[PDB]
Design a binder for this molecule. Structure first.
Ligand SMILES: [Mg+2]
Ligand SMILES: [Mg+2]
Ligand SMILES: [Mg+2]
Ligand SMILES: [Mg+2]
Ligand SMILES: [Mg+2]
Ligand SMILES: [Mg+2]
Ligand SMILES: [Mg+2]
Ligand SMILES: [Mg+2]
Ligand SMILES: [Mg+2]
Ligand SMILES: [Mg+2]
Ligand SMILES: [Mg+2]
Ligand SMILES: [Mg+2]
Ligand SMILES: [Mg+2]
Ligand SMILES: [Mg+2]
Ligand SMILES: [Mg+2]
Ligand SMILES: [Mg+2]
Ligand SMILES: [Mg+2]
Ligand SMILES: [Mg+2]
Ligand SMILES: [Mg+2]
Ligand SMILES: [Mg+2]
Ligand SMILES: [Mg+2]
Ligand SMILES: [Mg+2]
Ligand SMILES: [Mg+2]
Ligand SMILES: [Mg+2]
Ligand SMILES: [Mg+2]
Ligand SMILES: [Mg+2]
Ligand SMILES: [Mg+2]
Ligand SMILES: [Mg+2]
Ligand SMILES: [Mg+2]
Ligand SMILES: [Mg+2]
Ligand SMILES: [Mg+2]
Ligand SMILES: [Mg+2]
Ligand SMILES: [Mg+2]
Ligand SMILES: [Mg+2]
Ligand SMILES: [Mg+2]
Ligand SMILES: [Mg+2]
Ligand SMILES: [Mg+2]
Ligand SMILES: [Mg+2]
Ligand SMILES: [Mg+2]
Ligand SMILES: [Mg+2]
Ligand SMILES: [Mg+2]
Ligand SMILES: [Mg+2]
Ligand SMILES: [Mg+2]
Ligand SMILES: [Mg+2]
Ligand SMILES: [Mg+2]
Ligand SMILES: [Mg+2]
Ligand SMILES: [Mg+2]
Ligand SMILES: [Mg+2]
Ligand SMILES: [Mg+2]
Ligand SMILES: [Mg+2]
Ligand SMILES: [Mg+2]
Ligand SMILES: [Mg+2]
Ligand SMILES: [Mg+2]
Ligand SMILES: [Mg+2]
Ligand SMILES: [Mg+2]
Lengths: 82, 91, 200
RNA sequence: UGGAGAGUUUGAUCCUGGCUCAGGACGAACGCUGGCGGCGUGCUUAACACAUGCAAGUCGAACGGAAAGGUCUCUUCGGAGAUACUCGAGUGGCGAACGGGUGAGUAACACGUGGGUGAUCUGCCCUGCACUUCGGGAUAAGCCUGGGAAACUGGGUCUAAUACCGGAUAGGACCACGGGAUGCAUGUCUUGUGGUGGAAAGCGCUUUAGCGGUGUGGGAUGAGCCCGCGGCCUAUCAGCUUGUUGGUGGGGUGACGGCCUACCAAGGCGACGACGGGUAGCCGGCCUGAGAGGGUGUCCGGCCACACUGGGACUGAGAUACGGCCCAGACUCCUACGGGAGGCAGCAGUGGGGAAUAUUGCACAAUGGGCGCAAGCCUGAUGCAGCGACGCCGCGUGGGGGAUGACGGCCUUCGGGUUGUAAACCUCUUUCACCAUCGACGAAGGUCCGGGUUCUCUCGGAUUGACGGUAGGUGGAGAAGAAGCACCGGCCAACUACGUGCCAGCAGCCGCGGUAAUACGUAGGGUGCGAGCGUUGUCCGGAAUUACUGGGCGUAAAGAGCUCGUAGGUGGUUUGUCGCGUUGUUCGUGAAAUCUCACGGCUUAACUGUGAGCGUGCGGGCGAUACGGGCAGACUAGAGU
């Protein structure tokens, strides 16, 4: 069949993408909890950190540029309205 | 990628081929994007017919013909005209 | 297939001789069978069937080929029976018969089937071939000086030549100026009954 | 450019009205018979289960290593040496989402058609603007062990990368503020300002051997999504819905959206048939019919849906992911009982069902597809071959004189005639068969050389066809090797005799057979077709017996028992406006093959190529208000008071 190599590369991809996605999720929830805390001081830099992580993931290709733009806009408006 | 390929529509012992522009991910005898000539390998030398301007447009837009369509283009000179080569006809 | 049977029996059944030649008549009336001397009521379908069979056995045409000829004739614009007769005449055996290169239609079919004619210098062996305008017909060079041809080479001047065909001398070549007109040359049979037969 | 009727109710007639017939068609079967070639077609039933072989691999010009080949290499005299072309296995890249199969499910935006995407994504292809710059860590493979019957797996080292991670800088990422144009409302296209950020990779070279990657502009290509119109039966299915309908705020998607979520309203669908039941892949197409129409979706082409049954995720540009993965169920198999493996609705083939449908063949010779710089590799796609009269076409089974009225048979008025010029006898031709030979086009094609330095070109030296020594041609004696089939009472073409005597029997109807049967079995004779002829199965037509074309309702079947009135259909005269229906032109579209005209090529036809019709329609612009219609009015005749 010569697809055992494909299966191994697949599972390597699952681990890599799952790890980066979970890291991005944790960063997003950190920024969110800062947003409800309303410190408005460290949230300003957490926004930039989250944007950097998310568009780094987009460049890596684990996500799409459209999703990266949507999430960045959401977090920016989130910081804005408070 | 867009390709220019020969489509066979003759009978069992009359393999007539049509010079057509079709998508690569299609069957040989399928619905091509546009037919831009034909080729009959049953005459004495052959029967070669090329529009020579729709082929030029497709070549400039990115269409890539296969080996026999490339040979026919070289024969008709349209490939040479597109690439800027001196000899525009070698029939 | 081919009939390959008694032509005179068919002629007596049809009540109209259509072959002539050396064996034109049997010197007797036409009781085709055991009861053939008795009178029979003439039905409408009988006349049309007899006309169609007369044409088919005159031109050596099978039933399916005759059906195709009739359907092509009616599909063609203008008339139907005239076109059918023209198609029937356009056969190689009929052309040879009219040009007088054979004794009858059966002889013409025998020669053309055995392949003793090259139309455009090309060997053919099908009587079903149809001639067209500006088309030549020639005799095989090897097949010359043979008995079945030399027997008629000198006695082919008896039968008339149609107004659309022409014959050449010592070296025969057959050329087709235009399509024939059976309505004015050799029409012993009315096609207006066949056209009614084939619409039933 | 195209319209046939006949039989059958009665003592006899005319209507109405059934039933039957004559014709064609098929992915066909049966009975009998049966030569060949050209081209096509061939599990329609069990989406029943499968033995077996082949159907997706490639790159050393990305990388570490050397299992094999020839190898210079030490030399064993049968052992050594990755450094070398080359390469087992391994990392990595791409492909694998295409190609091939079935029509199960599906009455659905699944399909056909025409719009919208200011709601979108898009590898490999083309191409504009630039870069191609710095560090780090492990591991595959190998080696040493361990566990397990296997399927498989653990621990310890060890080596890379065009593998991974972390970096500098880069605007079509975002936010806020603006400029400039646009309308179709959310908006759309392009710059500026301030705050944010986001990648790349190196390898090879007979020295112009070549490859690459990314940051993004714009094309080409493929697709995701929405809408109007059209294509079954059933009301003996009349009330359906609650994320259901909408809104708001978030979440989610490439993208709009109850797609998901929290809150608010009570709404949304239904007699123009929802909801429910039965059935079904849709279309271009195919058959019949003069046509309208009726039937049908098989070859082929387009799409859709599915891959033992049911469910789910991931990789990836892109997944019903047949030959990928996870789980539940059934089945089959191995087992050491602890555990494992599997899915022909791919090609070929087997079992079973059925009236029934084919080789476990050849080759990548050509085309398409995938991998490289390539040379090259794979391809049951494809090109063929093999079996079947299964369908279309075509040719033969001979022909020239023959009244010996052969002999005979048959009928028989005992005179005759039919078989019947067909025969014998004289003769001509060898179409296709048999034997031998030559021998293809399909290949202005691909490799190793000569001008060209590589880009382009012809030249020849060599080779490359499964088909195939095949088509086809030639040479040889010989009519010599070659026909059968159905019917004969009316429909409908075809009559005598023998045996039989309501018995044997036939038959589509109505009718024949109970002792002179053109209707039964048989013999002769005739009719029609032909390597085919009849039966069965189904559809169309006749049937104007579901009638728009193209029917009727006093007595033949047909006016509700009457009235009112909901929806609906339909509507007086006249004026003005719109131009929706109507109609004209123009543009786009209406795929190809197939249907037709006209031609061209297979000796002809079937088959095939080309030009034009077809595609009855739809969207857009531009003309008309003659009629219907919308609106604005007016009149009295209709109608009402
Ligand atoms: Mg965590
Ligand atoms: Mg968003
Ligand atoms: Mg035939
Ligand atoms: Mg009647
Ligand atoms: Mg009476
Ligand atoms: Mg009565
Ligand atoms: Mg009447
Ligand atoms: Mg690989
Ligand atoms: Mg290797
Ligand atoms: Mg590559
Ligand atoms: Mg892939
Ligand atoms: Mg697939
Ligand atoms: Mg099936
Ligand atoms: Mg189905
Ligand atoms: Mg639609
Ligand atoms: Mg290790
Ligand atoms: Mg940066
Ligand atoms: Mg990098
Ligand atoms: Mg809710
Ligand atoms: Mg909402
Ligand atoms: Mg179905
Ligand atoms: Mg009719
Ligand atoms: Mg399923
Ligand atoms: Mg199965
Ligand atoms: Mg399943
Ligand atoms: Mg990919
Ligand atoms: Mg993905
Ligand atoms: Mg699945
Ligand atoms: Mg797969
Ligand atoms: Mg399979
Ligand atoms: Mg198969
Ligand atoms: Mg059976
Ligand atoms: Mg059986
Ligand atoms: Mg190949
Ligand atoms: Mg190829
Ligand atoms: Mg049979
Ligand atoms: Mg009769
Ligand atoms: Mg008797
Ligand atoms: Mg009888
Ligand atoms: Mg009928
Ligand atoms: Mg009708
Ligand atoms: Mg009536
Ligand atoms: Mg009465
Ligand atoms: Mg009555
Ligand atoms: Mg009444
Ligand atoms: Mg009553
Ligand atoms: Mg009553
Ligand atoms: Mg009303
Ligand atoms: Mg009204
Ligand atoms: Mg009016
Ligand atoms: Mg009205
Ligand atoms: Mg021709
Ligand atoms: Mg068309
Ligand atoms: Mg218009
Ligand atoms: Mg009044």
């Amino acid at each position: 069949k010569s697809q055992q190599k494909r299966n191994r590369t697949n599972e390597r991809a699952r681990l890599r993408n799952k790890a980066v996605k979970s890291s991005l999720r944790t960063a997003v929830r950190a920024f969110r909890e800062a947003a409800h805390a309303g410190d408005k001081a460290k949230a300003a830099e957490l926004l930039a950190s989250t944007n950097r992580k998310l568009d780094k993931a987009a460049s890596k290709g684990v996500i799409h540029k459209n999703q990266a733009a949507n999430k960045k806009s959401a977090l920016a408006q989130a910081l804005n309205k408070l | 990628a867009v390709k220019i390929k020969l489509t066979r529509l003759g009978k069992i012992r009359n393999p007539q081929y049509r010079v057509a522009v079709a998508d690569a991910r299609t069957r040989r005898d399928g619905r091509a994007i546009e037919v831009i000539g034909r080729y009959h390998p049953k005459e004495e030398p052959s029967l070669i017919e090329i529009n020579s301007e729709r082929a030029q447009y497709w070549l400039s837009v990115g269409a890539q013909p296969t080996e026999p369509v490339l040979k026919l283009l070289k024969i008709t000179g349209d490939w040479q005209k597109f690439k800027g080569l001196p000899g525009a006809q070698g029939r | 297939a081919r009939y390959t049977g008694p032509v005179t029996r068919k002629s007596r059944r049809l009540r109209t001789d259509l072959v002539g030649g050396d064996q034109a008549f049997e010197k007797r009336p036409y009781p085709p069978g055991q009861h053939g001397r008795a009178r029979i009521k003439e039905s409408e379908y009988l006349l049309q069937l007899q006309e169609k069979q007369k044409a088919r056995f005159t031109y050596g045409v099978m039933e399916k080929q005759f059906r195709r000829y009739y359907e092509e004739a009616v599909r063609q614009p203008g008339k139907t029976g005239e076109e059918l007769l023209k198609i029937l005449e356009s056969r190689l055996d009929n052309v040879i018969y009219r040009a007088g290169l054979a004794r009858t239609r059966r002889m013409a079919r025998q020669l053309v089937s055995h392949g003793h004619f090259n139309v455009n210098g090309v060997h053919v062996n099908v009587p079903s071939y149809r001639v067209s305008q500006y088309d030549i017909v020639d005799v095989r060079d090897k097949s010359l000086n043979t008995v079945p041809f030399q027997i008629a080479r000198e006695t082919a001047g008896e039968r008339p030549i149609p107004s659309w065909l022409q014959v050449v001398g010592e070296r025969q070549r057959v050329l087709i100026h235009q399509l024939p007109e059976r309505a004015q040359i050799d029409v012993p049979l009315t096609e207006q009954l066949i056209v009614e037969y084939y619409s039933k």
